[PDB]
Design a protein around this nucleic acid. Structure first.
Ligand SMILES: [Mg+2]
Ligand SMILES: [Zn+2]
Lengths: 1316, 66, 288, 54, 251
DNA sequence: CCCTGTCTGGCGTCCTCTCACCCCTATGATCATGA
DNA sequence: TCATGATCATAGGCGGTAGCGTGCGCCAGACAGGG
């Protein structure tokens, strides 16, 4: 079955793979993150409650006072979104917090407080998010963009090759906390182990192991095994486990049990280890040279002298053995220090250590942190407990603790946010294990190590920084005042909190201005994974590897939609199905392929769970049950594609559209384009402009409805029902009774957004697309937006294209367009410019906006009214007067030189106290009248719905067929009816009606207050006049058009109609492209799009022929059914036998300008299907029609390719780039011309052009190019007199900026001069 | 090498218009070094004719009248 | 990747093949970005090191120039003599091998007719005057530069050649990239250069030098093959002989450095004391 | 300003939250032990003037 | 500079000089009223560090800032590097009598001429038109001529066709790589708003027509017209200076 | 004094176009209202 | 008439009784460490 707007124009759909998971709501990152941020969240985390429970309770400097936390609450905003964008306020909500003050007594902090006080306090204004997913900061709609950064936890990197120039790789182990001090363990080419804290000075690593109160005996107990030597009657025998001897060449003949095992000069084989462990050999015999370099573990003391025989971690010599042998020790514990197995890295590290106990280690750490000051044991304890071991200054998140347990092979993924002793010891153990040769290092670009922050987490962090500044103020004030006399709003002030959050949302590196000229550009700017910003890398520094697609971007981050230029691969765009995990990583759906059958359950995999399993490719053929029809199937195991068996697979992809993003899944035939041209096509499809009447794509991907409905430019129905009143302003839906609340009678009113300014100076319009009396369903479009049509997404328009060289006018990439295109007004885009004029406050008095103006006459002032402001509707030229303004000297606002327009909307804002002039009172009466009429129509329309409910209830149960309309309509309650649900319902509707009466009274009073009041404004401004010009820019030689595949081009000549190549029917082609761009720039998808567009228009022409002849619905039903079946096993399977002879005529009314065809991305329409659809129309099979010429009237040889391509106009127009300057203004500090176009400036004759004129022999051209034309002021006035008198001659002089160089060098101690 | 061959000139304005300006101007400051505009780029700085094309004939005239 | 892309753009590409194509494409785009970033700075440093060099005289008055020979990597001759000695003033006047007969005088610009008359007589090495060996104080004379490139005649007195030179070197920096025996092909006389050779017992010619360079002199004088010959290599031929095509004339071992001798006699050990100077390591699984 | 206190056991960052803190007289990295010349041999002064500077 | 809001976001230099004068006046007052023995030392350290912030900020240990993270600009940051007087104001300058627009093809041109709009040719060539007006006697002063060419009356297009006729302009593509990147043409007036540029010539600019933008300059003086005709004309540079290959290869 | 490692200074394309942003918080003084 | 409270206007450089910094990289030449 189909929805009623899907019976208007049902898009033909090729495609073979039956879908199982539809496209999710495309704005779920922004909305879900900010819903996670601001919501009443119990059990502590996440949200604002995490900040308010981690920074509170503020306890004082031992004054026994404490400011603890209760709850919070956000009130309603004073301004809704529309008034906020008009006036210019933030769209914020006040953050009320309930704080409590308690004050303890003397001698008992575990005793009773004498007095508490709990109260409401005001702090900050956090800006809310609109339903589109955007913020309104100062009247300009802004987006905060998700950041891709390093995951907190341990990270074992390897500084490969480059250091020490000898190939010896290093290994470092960066512990990355979420908030606190970093910690980098590393090696050096002497194979010592070095710690460092926050990239500061370097210490040997075991100095922190003493700082955790470990003795050296315990350290060697941890980081090494033991070797036991027993002195038993002969040559100091040894306990030997032969696994340590795997490949070691002994120094003697190892024999045991009267049997020679190992010979001198040979090594111990593995089978000799098997012999020694099979015979269970324990004690072997060593020479005196064997313990010549063995390292003792613990301290041995002589019992008689009380001295030290040998210190810990010391090699043993002959005299040390002679001392400890005669003291009474039979057991000797040493360490195993092999070449391959276990290096003595800990032992060499302890030999570099000068420290000896806990205190000296804490002193040295306190000295490397803060240099050159007296340490004290209390200060060293406090610093080292506040580096890693305090809840305040150090905090891994849950993400950090998960990565730190997972990368150390733990079990519990839950732990504390602070470190401990076992954590650092496990980091050093894993680092030594990586140095030993077992285990692997971790790459950086792997998406199991890249977390995604969003709006909620970054706003929480900035709010937390505001709170630690305010706890730095409350700790100041709390124990330095008289108690009890103050309340907790005199202490805490809202300036740092609001300053922090307002600086983050106002100007950050990630809170950026929304590129809004297209529904696609909105919905793909909100889905952006930027690597830049705070905590990430920078553009002009890094690098190589991060600008490259890793093998685990498959289905998380789009590989082909990224901006080319200085930041490729850093401004990644997130894919279609890609959600965000609980912790912040990326996850993507798959289908659990149990042992034979592809089960239709979806199952979200992260980036590290994907690697262990094995995933089938998306388009693998399966026969109606899930059984894979091949016995070799293409899969990918561990980041590496291969060919696997039938039933060793564990997952299949969901749909074939999931590698790409929503920018580059509206490209039909994407699998035929080379990836560079698909990148340029997706980026230019983002850069489109909305035309006047947007049409539709004939060749789409079916993804248009998700991008249109799941954005916020169309007016989606909330509750379905029957339309009651359509208008260009409003739309009224009457809600069906099986969707309807019992109370609040309810018929909905959609106030559309008519002609208003977007951010890119386009024209964001909404047009109603429903008829009257028409049913609508829940979840359905009512009003099309900009670049939409019937709920689809129509960016550009589809035109008749031919690929042929035509007389050179399409030489490199140019485009040649018939005048039939510009006559139909079909690229005529509508732009809106906002021109502001402020009435400031200066000396000699304030300014005047009135029209009594000097130096002007009738010809200027005829287009102004009697109070200076231009009319609404006056079509002005470039350089007239819009607002007349004179200062205590003409300073009237003028149209900037070049642009026409029609003044559509004038706003006047008045700072309160200033006299409103007559036009400001006219606008006040106008908006009073509009808001009065609008709220009165709210009351009338909802009262009409309420009375219709009363009529619907009184059909039964005491019905009065004639007596109902004899009495006035406001008394439909006291009629004959007992105590039932109906009199209860009439009482509830009377409650609703009296609520509407008193609500209408109070809301009209509040709306008169909002219109009548002034507005807070800039320091020293009287009134602001804003005027909206509405230019209509058509098309001309110089604009940029482009298709959807990377075929760019400046349109080069707008030919007449007659010159166009026509065919043997009569129709001229509209646009003549260039064929030579196809084999080099390998975008072969545009030719398949051209042929399938010609097939679509062939079906449309046959419908137009079968309908223009007034044929009955039977033949239309026949032909539309044949055009909708037409293919292989497909998904569509429609039938017109359930459309009932009236929808088929209206469906053919919508198909007569062409039949829309969906072609999904990697499961598209093959060549034979295009041929069979070109055979259904009577077009030629090869797609090529023979074409005549317009000039000569004789045939082009070798018939050419025509069809329809869907081409977009880009907003790089030519009357926004063109500029010229004879003599304008000059800069102030260096007397050179200004830069730019708005400032009337000159083009930079840069350095390489100076080199290119030195490279010729042009000497006078360069002399006037940098002395006369540019800098020397007396030289250029002499030049201007000489040019207007006909004498071409220059008096050179000196550049004045060289005198500026002399003054800047001379302002140092340097004495530069000019000799002779 | 070309960056050291260009920083080691008998003309401090060329070596100042190239890389580090601090070291070049301090060395030429304490040495009392005296540029004589010596070619192309100093004359592009100071605003006169290049001694390459037509300005080469002008510079032969100017040097002959010295 | 060991499993290639068996699908072209006229047919489809499925998802993995298009993903691997994306690996290649984004690697290329990032190469072009950082490539431009280095190329512009290379052009800057070259036009700031040259910057000053103006063609300021008309004849320096020296003779010593560089020797232009066609480059020989060891295969086909890559850059011939016509494309190197095109338009540059000769250092010493070229005498054809009819010795004491002058072919060109010693200050003749070698334009296209003279280059064809060089190619006909198969002239070995036209010694020619270079900019680097000039004599003009504070500048470069006109004759040592050569033809005015981009024009036809000799260079005009004045055109700043340092700037056009530095732009011509740094301008194709956008196009550049960023990140057993001797087998003969042709036939001719055999030349050896810097060789110390001796006769083995087999009758061949063995070499006692690393600095040996083999050359193939053709029928008219020049050289079409050159080969660096290693130390102690064994030739199947000698000097001045004649070979045929496809004939490997030399063989050696790239793994072993041969310590071959000159005189024929017994071998004894001098200053070779066992245990210290030489050690006893018996090859276990072979025997020798 | 002259203040009497004791460096090590009472560490400075705890006391930082108050005034009296720009930093020690140093002439060097370490907080320099200052003389108290006024306290010891120069108690009572300012006969320069009461010029009330400017 | 005023920011038109009642306040002056000052330049960094006035901040630096203000810091030196504050610290110096406080040091004069502290040397006036006698320094407390081993005391007249911290203030001189502060003055030395403020002067070292003024002459070269950031060379001594951690630099200063006004707002917020960015270190502010001393004198050596005005002479050195990019954004300084050697590379931004003295070696490459902003230039009057110049303009820029988007290029296009127009193959009906001879190779020594390019299409150029009527609006750009009227705004580049203004004082030439003023001189021809008061030389032919169609405006008394300069102000009547300026108001005539602002109204664009029917006679100034004949004046403009009489001043374009034998007067070259310089076309320039924005990344000039080698010396063929600046060439000189003789303009032809075009109804439209783009620069029609001969196709063969676009082999030397490395310029396609997918949105490229080129800038035109005007040679004012007489010697510069002769240098843009004899040295830099588009018919003269047919050979590259890198080799002997022609640069007019048909593309 | 003769290496050999560390440290801190230099440097890292051109041209153009668009947009926002460019103190708020605390203390003191004056005026008005209430007792 | 006096006192207290509230509102408005005018005036300066981590904010705090610490700690923030952490994702470039190469070359080069001086300063110093080890022997
Ligand atoms: Mg291009
Ligand atoms: Zn010479």
């Amino acid at each position: 079955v189909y929805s009623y707007t899907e019976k208007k124009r049902i898009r033909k759909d090729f495609g073979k793979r039956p879908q199982v998971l539809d496209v999710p709501y495309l704005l779920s990152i922004q909305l879900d993150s900010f819903q996670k941020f601001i919501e009443q969240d119990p059990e502590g985390q996440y949200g604002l409650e995490a900040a308010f429970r981690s920074v509170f309770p503020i306890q004082s400097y031992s004054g026994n006072s404490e400011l603890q936390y209760v709850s919070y609450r956000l009130g309603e905003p004073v301004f809704d979104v529309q008034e906020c964008q008009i006036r210019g306020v933030t769209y914020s909500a006040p953050l009320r917090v309930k704080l409590r003050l308690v004050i303890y007594e003397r001698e008992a902090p575990e005793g009773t407080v004498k007095d508490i006080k709990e109260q409401e306090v005001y702090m900050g204004e956090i800006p809310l998010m609109t339903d589109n997913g955007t913020f309104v900061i100062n009247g300009t709609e802004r987006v905060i963009v998700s950041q891709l950064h390093r995951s907190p936890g341990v990270f074992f990197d390897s500084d490969k090759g480059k250091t020490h120039s000898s190939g010896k790789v290093l290994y470092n182990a960066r512990i990355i906390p979420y908030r606190g001090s970093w910690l980098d363990f590393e090696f050096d080419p002497k194979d010592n182990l070095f710690v460092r804290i926050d990239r500061r000075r370097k210490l040997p690593a075991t100095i922190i192991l003493r700082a955790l109160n470990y003795t050296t005996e315990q350290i060697l107990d941890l980081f090494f095994e033991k070797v036991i030597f027993e002195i038993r009657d002969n040559k100091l025998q040894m306990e030997l486990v032969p696994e340590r001897l795997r490949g070691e060449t002994a120094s003697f003949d190892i024999e045991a049990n009267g049997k020679v095992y190992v010979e001198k000069g040979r090594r111990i084989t593995a089978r000799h280890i098997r012999q020694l462990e099979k015979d269970d050999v324990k004690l072997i015999e060593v020479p005196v040279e064997y313990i010549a370099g063995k390292v003792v573990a613990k301290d041995y003391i002589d019992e008689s002298t009380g001295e030290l025989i040998c210190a810990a971690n010391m090699e043993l010599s002959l005299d040390l053995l002679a001392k400890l042998s005669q003291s009474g020790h039979k057991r000797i514990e040493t360490l195993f220090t092999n070449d391959l197995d276990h290096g003595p890295y800990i032992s060499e590290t302890l030999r570099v250590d000068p420290t000896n106990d806990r205190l000296s280690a804490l002193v040295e750490i306190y000295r490397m942190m803060r240099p050159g000051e007296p340490p004290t044991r209390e200060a060293a304890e406090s610093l080292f407990e506040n580096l890693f071991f305090s809840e305040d200054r150090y905090d891994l998140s849950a993400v950090g603790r998960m990565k730190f347990n997972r990368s150390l092979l733990r079990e519990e993924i839950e732990g504390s946010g602070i470190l401990s002793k076992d954590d650092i010891i496990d980091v050093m153990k894993k680092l030594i294990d990586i140095r030993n040769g077992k285990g692997e290092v971790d790459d950086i670009d792997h998406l199991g190590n890249r977390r995604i922050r969003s709006v909620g987490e970054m706003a929480e962090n900035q709010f937390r920084v505001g709170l630690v500044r305010v706890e730095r103020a409350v700790k100041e004030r709390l124990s330095l005042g008289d108690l009890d006399t103050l309340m907790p709003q005199d202490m805490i002030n809202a300036k740092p909190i609001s300053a922090a959050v307002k600086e983050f949302f106002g100007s950050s590196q990630l809170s950026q201005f929304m590129d809004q000229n297209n529904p696609l550009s909105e919905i793909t700017h909100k889905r952006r994974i930027s690597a830049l910003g705070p905590g990430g890398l920078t553009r002009e520094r890094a690098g190589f590897e991060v600008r490259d697609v890793h093998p685990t971007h498959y289905g998380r981050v789009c590989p082909i939609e990224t901006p080319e230029g200085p930041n490729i691969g850093l401004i990644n765009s997130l894919s279609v199905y890609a959600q965000t995990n609980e912790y912040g990583f990326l996850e993507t759906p798959y289908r659990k392929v149990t042992d034979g059958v592809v089960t239709d359950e979806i199952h979200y995999l992260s980036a590290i769970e994907e690697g262990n399993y094995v995933i089938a490719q998306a388009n693998s053929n399966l026969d109606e049950e899930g059984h894979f029809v091949e016995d070799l199937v293409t899969c990918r195991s561990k980041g590496e594609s291969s060919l696997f068996s039938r039933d060793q697979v564990d997952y299949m992809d969901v749909s074939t559209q999931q590698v790409v993003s929503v920018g580059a899944s509206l490209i039909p035939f994407l699998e035929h384009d080379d990836a560079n041209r698909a990148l340029m096509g997706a980026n230019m499809q983002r850069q489109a402009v909305p035309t006047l009447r947007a049409d539709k794509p004939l060749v789409g991907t079916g993804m248009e409805r998700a991008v249109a409905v799941d954005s916020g430019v169309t007016a989606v129905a909330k509750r379905g029902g029957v339309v009651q009143y359509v208008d260009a302003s409003r739309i009224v839906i009457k809600v069906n009774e099986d969707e309807m609340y019992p109370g609040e009678a309810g018929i909905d009113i959609y106030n559309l957004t008519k002609y208003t300014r977007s951010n890119q100076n386009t024209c964001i319009n909404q047009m109603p697309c429903v008829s009257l009396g028409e049913p609508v369903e829940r979840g359905d479009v009512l009003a099309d937006g900009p670049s939409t049509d019937l709920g689809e997404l129509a960016l550009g328009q589809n035109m008749r294209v031919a690929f042929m060289p035509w007389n050179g006018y399409n030489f490199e990439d140019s485009i040649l367009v018939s005048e039939r295109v510009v006559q139909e007004d079909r690229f005529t885009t509508i732009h809106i410019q906002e021109l502001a004029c402020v009435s400031r406050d200066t000396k000699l008095g304030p300014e005047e906006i009135t029209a009594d103006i000097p130096n002007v006459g009738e010809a200027a002032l005829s287009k102004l009214d009697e109070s200076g402001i231009v009319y609404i509707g006056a079509e002005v030229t470039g350089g007239d007067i819009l607002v007349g303004k004179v200062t205590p000297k003409d300073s009237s606002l003028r149209v900037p030189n070049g642009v026409s327009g029609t003044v559509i909307d004038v706003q006047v804002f008045t700072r309160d106290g200033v006299e409103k002039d007559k036009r400001a009172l006219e606008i006040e009466e106008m908006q009073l009248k509009q808001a009065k009429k609008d709220l009165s129509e709210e009351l009338q329309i909802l009262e009409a719905g309420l009375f219709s409910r009363i009529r619907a209830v009184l059909v039964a149960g005491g019905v009065e067929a004639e007596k109902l309309d004899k009495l006035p309509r406001d008394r439909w309650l006291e009629l004959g009816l007992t105590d039932e649900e109906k009199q209860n319902q009439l009482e509830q509707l009377a409650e609703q009606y009296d609520e509407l009466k008193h609500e209408f009274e109070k809301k009209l009073e509040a709306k008169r207050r909002k219109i009548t009041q002034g507005d807070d404004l800039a320091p020293g401004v009287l009134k602001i006049v804003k005027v909206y010009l509405a230019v209509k820019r058509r098309i001309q030689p110089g604009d940029k058009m482009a298709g959807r595949h990377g075929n760019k081009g400046v349109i080069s000549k707008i030919n007449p109609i007659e010159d166009m190549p026509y065919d043997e029917n009569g129709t001229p082609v509209d646009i003549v492209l260039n064929p030579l761009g196809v084999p080099s720039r390998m975008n072969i998808g545009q030719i398949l799009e051209t042929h399938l567009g010609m097939a679509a228009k062939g079906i449309g022409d046959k419908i137009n022929a079968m309908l223009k002849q007034q044929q009955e619905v039977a033949k239309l039903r026949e032909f539309i059914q044949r055009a909708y079946d037409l293919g292989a096993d497909v998904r569509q399977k429609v039938d017109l036998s359930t459309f009932s002879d009236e929808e088929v005529m209206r469906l053919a009314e919508n198909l007569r300008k062409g039949m829309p065809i969906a072609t999904p991305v990697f499961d598209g329409a093959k060549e034979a299907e295009i041929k069979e659809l070109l055979k259904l129309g009577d077009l030629p099979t090869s797609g090529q029609i023979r074409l005549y010429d317009g000039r000569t009237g004789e045939q082009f040889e070798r018939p050419v390719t025509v069809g329809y391509m869907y081409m977009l106009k880009l907003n790089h127009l030519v009357d926004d780039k063109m500029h010229a300057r004879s003599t304008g203004s000059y800069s102030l500090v260096t007397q050179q011309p200004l830069g730019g176009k708005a400032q009337f400036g000159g083009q930079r004759f840069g350095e390489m052009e100076v080199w290119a004129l030195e490279a010729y022999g042009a000497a006078y051209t360069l002399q006037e190019m940098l002395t006369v034309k540019s800098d020397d002021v007396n030289g250029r006035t002499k030049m201007y007199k000489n040019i207007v008198d006909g004498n071409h001659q220059m008096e050179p002089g000196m550049p004045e900026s060289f005198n500026v160089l002399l003054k800047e060098i001379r302002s140092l101690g340097i004495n530069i001069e000019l000799e002779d | 090498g070309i960056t050291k061959a260009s920083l080691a000139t008998e003309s401090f304005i060329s070596a100042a218009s190239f890389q580090e300006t601090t070291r070049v101007l301090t060395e030429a400051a304490v040495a009392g070094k005296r540029d004589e505009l010596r070619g192309l780029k100093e004359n592009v700085i100071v605003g006169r004719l290049i001694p390459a094309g037509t300005g080469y004939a002008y510079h032969q005239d100017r040097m002959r009248r010295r | 990747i060991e499993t290639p892309i068996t699908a072209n753009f006229r047919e489809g590409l499925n998802v993995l093949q298009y993903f691997i194509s994306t690996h290649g494409a984004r690697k290329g785009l990032a190469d072009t970005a950082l490539k431009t970033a280095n190329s512009g700075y290379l052009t800057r440093r070259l036009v700031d090191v040259a910057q000053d060099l103006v063609v300021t005289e008309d004849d320096c008055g020296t003779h010593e120039g560089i020797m232009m020979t066609p480059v020989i990597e060891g295969g086909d001759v890559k850059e011939p003599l016509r494309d190197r000695v095109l338009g540059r003033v000769t250092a010493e006047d070229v005498l054809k091998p009819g010795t004491a007969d002058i072919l060109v005088p010693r200050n003749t610009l070698l334009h296209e007719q003279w280059c064809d008359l060089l190619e006909e007589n198969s002239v070995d090495a036209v010694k020619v005057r270079s900019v680097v060996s000039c004599d003009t104080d504070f500048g470069v004379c006109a004759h040592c530069y050569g033809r005015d490139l981009a024009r036809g005649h000799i260079i005009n007195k004045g055109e700043a050649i340092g700037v056009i030179a530095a732009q011509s070197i740094g301008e194709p920096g956008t196009q550049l990239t960023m990140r057993s025996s001797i087998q003969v092909k042709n036939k001719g006389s055999i030349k050896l250069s810097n060789v110390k050779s001796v006769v083995n017992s087999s009758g061949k010619l063995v070499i006692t030098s690393r600095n040996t360079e083999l050359k193939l002199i053709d029928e008219f004088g020049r050289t079409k093959e050159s080969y660096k010959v290693p130390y102690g290599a064994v030739l199947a031929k000698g000097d001045g002989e004649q070979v045929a095509g496809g004939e490997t004339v030399a063989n050696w071992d790239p793994h072993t450095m041969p310590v071959i001798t000159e005189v024929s006699g017994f071998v004894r050990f001098t200053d070779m004391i066992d245990g210290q100077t030489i050690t006893r390591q018996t090859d276990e699984l072979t025997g020798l | 300003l002259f203040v009497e206190f004791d460096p090590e056991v009472i560490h400075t960052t705890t006391i930082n939250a108050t005034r009296g803190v720009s930093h020690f007289v140093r002439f060097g990295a370490s907080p320099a032990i200052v003389p108290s010349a006024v306290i010891h041999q120069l108690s009572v002064y300012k006969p320069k003037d009461i010029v009330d500077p400017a | 500079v005023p920011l038109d809001g009642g306040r002056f976001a000052t330049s960094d230099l006035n901040d630096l000089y203000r810091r030196v004068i504050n610290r110096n006046n406080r040091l004069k007052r502290l040397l006036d009223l006698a320094a407390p023995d081993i005391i007249v030392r911290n203030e001189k350290r502060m003055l030395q560090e403020a002067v070292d912030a003024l002459l070269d900020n950031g060379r001594r240990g951690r630099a200063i800032t006004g707002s917020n993270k960015r270190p502010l600009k001393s004198l050596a940051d005005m002479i050195k590097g990019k954004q300084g007087r050697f590379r931004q104001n003295l070696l490459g300058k902003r230039v009057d009598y110049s303009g820029r627009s988007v290029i296009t093809v127009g193959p009906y041109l001879r190779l020594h001429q390019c299409g150029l709009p009527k609006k750009m040719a009227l705004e580049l060539f203004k004082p030439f038109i003023y001189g021809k007006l008061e030389l032919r006697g169609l405006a008394t002063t300069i102000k009547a001529a300026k108001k005539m060419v602002e109204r664009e009356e029917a006679v100034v297009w004949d004046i403009l066709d009489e001043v374009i006729r034998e007067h070259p302009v310089l076309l320039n593509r924005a990344p000039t790589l080698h010396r063929l990147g600046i060439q000189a043409f003789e303009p032809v007036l075009i109804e439209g708003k783009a620069i029609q540029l001969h196709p063969l010539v676009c082999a030397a600019y490395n310029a396609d027509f997918d949105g490229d933008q080129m800038a035109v300059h005007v040679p004012l003086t007489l010697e510069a017209q002769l240098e843009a005709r004899a040295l830099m004309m588009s018919t003269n540079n047919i050979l590259s200076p890198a080799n002997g290959e022609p640069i007019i290869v048909p593309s």
